């Protein structure tokens, strides 16, 4: 992501 998961 870091946003991802």
Residue corresponding to tokens 């998961």: 5
Report DSSP state, residue 5: -
> Which single residue is written with the structure tokens 């946003």?
3
In angstroms, how far is the first alpha carbon of the chain from the final one?
Answer: 6
Provide the total of helices (H) and of strands (E) in the chain, helices listed first.
Answer: 0, 0
- Report CA 2 to chain centroid distance, whole Å: 3
Interatomic CA distance for residues 5 and 1, integer angstroms = 6
What per-residue string of b and e applies to 1-5 under the rule 16 or more CB within 10 Å gives b? Answer: eeeee
Query: What span, in angstroms and rounded, lies between the C-alpha atoms of 3 and 5?
Result: 6
Q: Is 2 left (phi over 0), alpha (psi -120 to 50) or beta?
A: alpha
């Amino acid at each position: 992501x870091p946003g991802c998961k």
